[PDB]
C-alpha cells in the first residue's frame, strides 16, 4: 500500500541515555552531553556509553518512515485527514490524542472511503 | 548401522578476539580430525549447526538449531572461522557443534 523504499536500516536502535542517569534518580535519562574535565564519557574511554553523533544519521531515502513505509501525519479532523488524498501510498494518518471518541468514528469512516491508512484506529473505541 | 552421523564432530572454542577484546560476530571451531590449515580448506563453506534443547516446544520439538557456515581457516592447526545466522551464546564455549558435508564440491 506504499512506495518502493530500500530496506530500512536503523544504524543505532538503542536509546542514548545520559551518563549516570542510571546512577542517581535526580538525573533524567534525557540525553545531555558531559562537559566535565576528566570525564571518561567525554574523553571516550573504552567501556562506556556511546554518545549521539552525526555519523548515526538515517538514510534520507528511508528517514521518517515507519515499518509500513509511510511517513505519519497528525490528523485532527476530516479537513486535515483529506490533505493526504492524493498521497495515499506515501503518508499515513495519526489521530490526535485529544480527538473525541465520536469524532474518531467519522475520521475513521472518511479514511476508509479514501483509502488513507490509519495508524491509531482502535483508538477511543467502545468494545 | 548404530551410526547415523553424516557430520563431522566439532567444538566451539572462542569468539574472535585480541588479548582483551572479543568479537561475538565471528566464532572459532575446532574440527575433529583437522590438524592443519590445508586440511581445514576442505570444510570452507560447509554448514555448521549448534543443536540445543529447550522447555517450550515450537514446531512440536523441544530441540532447536543455530545454523551457520565455515568461512575461513584460523591459525596453523586446523581451527576454522565460522559465522552463524545469529551468534553463538558463549555459554557454549566448549560445547559441541556439527560440520556437515554440504555444499559438496566433492
Amino acid at each position: 500500500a506504499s512506495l518502493p523504499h530500500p530496506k530500512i536500516v536503523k544504524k543505532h536502535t538503542k536509546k542514548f541515555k545520559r551518563h549516570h542517569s542510571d546512577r542517581y534518580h535526580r538525573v533524567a535519562e534525557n540525553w545531555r552531553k558531559q562537559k566535565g574535565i576528566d570525564s571518561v564519557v567525554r574523553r571516550r574511554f573504552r567501556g562506556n556509553i556511546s554518545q549521539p553523533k552525526i555519523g548515526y544519521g538515517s538514510n534520507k531515502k528511508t528517514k521518517f518512515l515507519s515499518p509500513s513505509g509511510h511517513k505519519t501525519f497528525l490528523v485532527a479532523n476530516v479537513k486535515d485527514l483529506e490533505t493526504l488524498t492524493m498521497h495515499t501510498k506515501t503518508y499515513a494518518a495519526e489521530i490526535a490524542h485529544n480527538i473525541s471518541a465520536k469524532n474518531r468514528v467519522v475520521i475513521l469512516a472518511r479514511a476508509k472511503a479514501l483509502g488513507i491508512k490509519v495508524t491509531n484506529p482502535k483508538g477511543r473505541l467502545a468494545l | 548401522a548404530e551410526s547415523h552421523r553424516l557430520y563431522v564432530k566439532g567444538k566451539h572454542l572462542s569468539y574472535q578476539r585480541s588479548k582483551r577484546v572479543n568479537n561475538p560476530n565471528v566464532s572459532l571451531i575446532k574440527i575433529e580430525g583437522v590438524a592443519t590449515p590445508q586440511d581445514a580448506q576442505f570444510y570452507l563453506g560447509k554448514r555448521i549447526a549448534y543443536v540445543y534443547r529447550a522447555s517450550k516446544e515450537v514446531r512440536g520439538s523441544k530441540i532447536r538449531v543455530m545454523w551457520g557456515k565455515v568461512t575461513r581457516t584460523h591459525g596453523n592447526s586446523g581451527v576454522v572461522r565460522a559465522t552463524f545466522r545469529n551468534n553463538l551464546p558463549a555459554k557454549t564455549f566448549g560445547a559441541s557443534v556439527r560440520i556437515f558435508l554440504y555444499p559438496s564440491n566433492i
Binding site: - | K11, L13, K30, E32, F93, G94, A95, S96
Partner: protein
C-alpha cells in the same frame, strides 16, 4: 574424541602436563589424572623443596587462615599448577575445572580403565639426559603429606591384582592368535589382504 580421558601421571613433567590438560578442559574434554605421586619436576629435590618453602612462608599477616593455602598432597600440588593456567575466578573457568579429577594412585572405577600418556609432557621425551629432576611424592612427604606409605602399600596390592589380570588376558589373546592360525590363510584372508585388511 572421547568421553573421559584417564592419564597415567607417571613420567610427566608437572607444568607441561598441566598446560596440556588445562587446555583440554576449556575445550570440553573430561579429564581425570591419576598416580599424581609419581609425577616429575625438572630440577633435583633440594631446589623444589626450597621453592615449595618459598611458597610456604606466604600468608595473610593478620590471619593466616585467609591468606594463601598450601595444599601439600601431590594431587593438589599439581592442581595448584593447573588452576594457575585457567581463568577460574570466572564462570567459564569454574566449569572447566569441573571437568577434571586428580588422583594419588589409581582408585576404583579407573582401576579397569586404560590410562594414556601425553608425549609432549613425558619427561623421557622432553628432558635432556643427565639433567637432575624430582619425584613429587618424595617432595610432598617432605612438606607434610601424611600418606606416601599408604598409597605405596595399596599400589603394591593393586599391581598384584593387575598382574594376574594381564596374565589372564595375555593367555586369551594367545588362544585368539593361536586359533587364528587356521583362518590366517583362507580365501577371505587373501580377499581382505587385497584391500589392506
Amino acid at each position: 574424541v572421547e568421553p573421559v580421558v584417564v592419564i597415567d601421571g607417571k613420567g610427566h613433567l608437572v607444568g607441561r602436563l598441566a598446560s596440556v590438560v588445562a587446555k583440554q578442559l576449556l575445550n570440553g574434554q573430561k579429564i581425570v589424572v591419576v598416580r599424581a605421586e609419581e609425577l616429575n619436576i625438572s630440577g633435583e629435590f633440594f631446589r623444589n623443596k626450597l621453592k615449595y618453602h618459598d611458597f610456604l612462608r606466604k600468608a595473610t599477616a593478620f590471619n593466616k587462615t585467609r591468606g594463601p593455602f598450601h595444599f601439600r598432597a601431590p594431587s593438589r600440588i599439581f592442581y595448584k599448577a593447573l588452576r594457575g593456567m585457567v581463568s577460574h575466578k570466572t564462570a567459564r573457568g569454574k566449569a572447566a575445572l569441573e571437568r577434571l579429577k586428580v588422583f594419588e594412585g589409581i582408585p576404583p572405577p579407573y582401576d579397569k580403565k586404560k590410562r594414556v600418556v601425553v608425549p609432549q609432557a613425558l619427561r623421557v621425551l622432553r628432558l635432556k639426559p643427565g639433567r637432575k629432576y624430582t619425584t613429587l611424592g618424595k617432595l610432598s612427604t617432605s612438606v607434610g603429606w601424611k600418606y606416601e606409605d599408604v598409597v605405596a602399600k595399596l599400589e603394591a596390592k593393586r599391581k598384584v591384582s593387575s598382574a594376574e589380570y594381564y596374565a589372564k588376558k595375555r593367555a586369551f589373546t594367545k588362544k585368539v592368535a593361536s586359533a587364528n592360525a587356521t583362518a590366517a590363510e583362507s580365501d577371505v584372508a587373501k580377499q581382505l589382504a587385497a584391500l589392506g585388511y
